[PDB]
């Protein structure tokens, strides 16, 4: 039920929207979380998604980590979407502020290819420290499935479209 999106390519779409509000409106099959390897959803997209689930996402994530250990940078896991989606694909993009290799951003986007359609943020952008224009280019050049990108900041949305 996605609406108001601008088509960038055959499979990539973009909208100036809060991913939490977009998830509550659409209730997609898959919402992507901008996760860290420990699934500690403190801030950014992860903190906002977890807060919308009344912390049920953090409780579920802590049990997952206790059983399986941390994810790899560039890796992912599928957990419940709670009240936002059927599923949440927790994807770990490299955190540039922590010295993580930006080359892992392509591996992180490759996780999207296991799902026919997804609502997602730009990986590694925001508090993760990477250039969002770079993140959109890697998204477009890596993801082959249908991805609906929610870009929170209006000025960033405008720059992303103008420079595409
Ligand atoms: C530094 S920047 O990436 O160019 N600018 C930026 C400006 C404002 C925000 C951001 C990042 C910050 C971050 O969550 O780590 N936000 C998002 O990517 C985002 N996207 C969709 N829906 C959302 N709901 C809550 C956050 C959010 C980034």
In the chain, the domains with their CATH numbers are: 6-161 (3.40.220.10)
Three-state DSSP class for residue 12: strand
Query: Dihedrals φ, ψ of 20, to 5°?
Result: -65, -50
Q: Name the experiment that determined this structure.
A: X-ray
Q: Spell out the alpha helix ranges (H) of 2-131.
A: 19-26, 44-52, 56-68, 104-110
Residue to mutate (ligand 1; options 95, 125, 130; most atoms within 8 A of CB)? 125
What distance in angstroms lies between residue 122's CA and the mean position of ligand 1's atoms?
A: 8
Would you mind telling me the total number of residues written for the chain in this entry?
Answer: 164
**Mutational test site, ligand 1, from 48, 52, 121, 147, max ligand atoms within 8 Å of CB:** 121
- Cα 154 to averaged position of ligand 1 atoms, centre (Å): 10
CA dihedral 76, 29, 17, 89 (to 10 degrees): -10
- Asked if 24 and 156 count as a contact pair (C-beta separation under 8 A), the reply is no
Q: What are residue 34's DSSP bridge partners?
A: 91
CA neighbor of 119 nearest in space, from 18, 9, 10, 39: 18
> What span, in angstroms and rounded, lies between the C-alpha atoms of 47 and 135?
20
Token digits of residue 76: 């992912």
46-56: b or e for each residue (b if 16 or more CB lie within 10 Å)?
Answer: bebbbebbeee
Q: Rg (Cα) of the chain, in Å, rounded? A: 14
Which of 112-129 are b and which e, b meaning 16 or more Cβ less than 10 Å from the residue's Cβ?
Answer: beebeebbbbbbbbbebb
Task: Residue 90: name the closest of 20, 50, 39, 51 by CA.
Answer: 39
* Residue closest by Cα to atom 16 of ligand 1: 126
DSSP 8-state class, residue 116: S
Q: For residue 3, count other CB atoms closer than 10 A to its CB.
A: 9
**Atom number in ligand 1 closest to CA 48:** 25
């Amino acid at each position: 039920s996605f609406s108001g999106y601008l088509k960038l390519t055959d499979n990539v779409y973009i909208k100036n929207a809060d991913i939490v509000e977009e998830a509550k409106k659409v209730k997609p099959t898959v919402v992507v979380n901008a996760a860290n390897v420990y699934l500690k959803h403190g801030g950014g997209v992860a903190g906002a998604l977890n807060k919308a689930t009344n912390n049920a996402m953090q409780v579920e994530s802590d049990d997952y980590i206790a059983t399986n250990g941390p994810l790899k940078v560039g890796g992912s896991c599928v957990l419940s979407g709670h009240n936002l989606a059927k599923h949440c694909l927790h994807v770990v993009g490299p955190n540039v502020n922590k010295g993580e290799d930006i080359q892992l951003l392509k591996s992180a986007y490759e996780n999207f290819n296991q799902h026919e359609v997804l609502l997602a943020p730009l990986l590694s952008a925001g508090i993760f420290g990477a250039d969002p224009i770079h993140s959109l280019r890697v998204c477009v050049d890596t993801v082959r499935t249908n991805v609906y990108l929610a870009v929170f900041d209006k000025n960033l949305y405008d720059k992303l479209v103008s420079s595409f």
